[PDB]
Paper text:
[name] is a [name]-binding protein required for [name]-restriction of CpG-rich viral genomes. It contains an extended diKH, PIN nuclease, and CUElike domain, each of which are required for [name] restriction of viral replication. Our crystal structure reveals an extended PIN domain (ex-PIN) containing a conserved N-terminal arm region required for domain stability and an active site tetra-Asp motif, which are both required for antiviral activity. Unlike the weak activity recently reported for the PIN domain, we demonstrate that the [name] ex-PIN domain is a highly active Mn2+-dependent single-stranded RNA endonuclease that cleaves with a preference for ApC, ApA, and UpA dinucleotides.
Residue numbers in the entry: 411 to 487, 490 to 511, 524 to 542, 551 to 594
Write the structure that this text describes.
């Protein structure tokens, strides 16, 4: 029992260890909705920064080196669980503080651009075009193997620039 007690599924250990090796060259820039990811991991209740760290480790492990986690500036003050993961991401040039959806669309426009996330439809629509949904189990980050359905591409080719 206890919704809070169980969220200490955080006792299952996770360390952000990004292997110091160069990445593959034609992969797409991974744009991460830091808030969405952190809330999904925190069961829409906690800002669970480990959610972001886990998601970065996933793409870092596939060889992606152009990764940007957007998180609001005030999420550095703010009910944030394990904020130490944000500090580490910031200092490794993987995290930019928004001063909000427009920044991800802007960024993914400028780069090859994949958005990792679950009026003014112009901005809302652009997100649909590049959306990569996800789920967590615990520290396990899972993304669909056909990001856009069976008609659309495979995961491997969805994350390639060509």
């Amino acid at each position: 029992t206890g919704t809070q007690r169980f969220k200490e599924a955080l006792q299952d250990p996770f360390t952000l260890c990004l292997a110091n090796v160069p990445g593959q060259p034609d992969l797409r820039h991974i744009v991460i909705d830091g808030s969405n990811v952190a809330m999904v991991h925190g069961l829409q209740h906690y800002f669970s920064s480990r959610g972001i760290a886990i998601a970065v480790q996933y793409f870092w492990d596939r060889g992606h080196r152009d990764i940007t986690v957007f998180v609001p500036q005030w999420r550095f003050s703010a009910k944030v669980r394990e904020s130490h993961f944000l500090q580490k991401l910031y200092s490794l040039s993987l995290l930019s503080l928004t001063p909000d959806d427009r920044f991800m669309v802007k960024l993914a426009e400028e780069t090859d651009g994949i958005i990792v996330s679950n009026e003014s439809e112009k901005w809302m629509a652009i997100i649909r075009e590049r959306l990569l949904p996800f789920t967590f189990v615990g520290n396990l980050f899972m993304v669909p193997d056909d990001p856009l359905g069976r008609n659309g591409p495979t995961l491997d080719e969805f994350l390639k620039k060509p």
